[PDB]
Amino acid sequence: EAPRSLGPAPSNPSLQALFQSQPSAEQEWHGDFGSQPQANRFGAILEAVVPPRSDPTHEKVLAIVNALLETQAIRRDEAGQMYTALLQRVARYNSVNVQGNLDRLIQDVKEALAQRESVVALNAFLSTQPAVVERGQENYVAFVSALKLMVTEAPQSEVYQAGPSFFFQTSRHGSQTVNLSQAFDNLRPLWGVSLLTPNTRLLLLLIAPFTGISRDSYLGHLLTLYRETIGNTRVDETTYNEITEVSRADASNLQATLNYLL
């Protein structure tokens, strides 16, 4: 969770380069000229009348390297190395066409970063999974639809292939991984029909809040009971919080309530 780049705006690499390599008198992030001394007044007047032209090459390269840092194509500690290498290359092949290409690349990378600021793996997994079963092609179809809906609506969830099996993980740094291949292999003999492994039990518990299934089928009954259990768990959490907060005006009290409550 460390800041990838120094600038206050993680996106807009041009803005980040503005923040890093520009004087803090032109920037904006949100006196009495005439009483100033003669030297300052004359310097400001001359600079205003005849503005000093400067090369926007180092700024462009800094914006590019900030974009690369944001994209993670360049590690944090080699930013200076890449900056110097890019400056050397640009100076070696400097031209108006090269400057135009640099500006175009900065604009394109800024747009791409702004636009950007698992599904294909699930599609491949569904493709390798058989789509026809001899025990009702509606429970399977609705379950697949629920799985796709939940993986799409999950904020940070990953589906990936690890050798010969496909896995589903609820979060990047979590501890809830479901072997989808084995779960569906276990579920296949009993679509339309205690005997389920913990992997497929966890899959069902995860998909229950995000699910068309006919209630007559075994999977329908299991999903209804899992929904009921999850609702009981939420209401039990609310009751536990209320009881504990009231009883704290003892860890032994938490022990007693949890034991009586589970």
Binding site: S252, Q255, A256
Partner: protein, 51 residues
């Protein structure tokens, strides 16, 4: 038992009470102690030996 048996609110097991005042005449040695029984904790004087 786990609950409603032990204090677990940072209280002592033994207390040493120095005498508030004392006199040592030629015959005896009289000492006055001011023992304060907590706010909730309770004792029985099968303990409380004089040292």
């Amino acid at each position: 038992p786990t609950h409603d048996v032990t204090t677990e609110r940072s209280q002592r097991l033994q207390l040493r009470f120095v005498p508030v005042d004392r006199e040592d005449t030629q015959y005896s040695y009289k000492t006055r102690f001011q023992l304060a029984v907590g706010d909730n904790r309770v004792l029985d004087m099968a303990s409380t030996y004089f040292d």
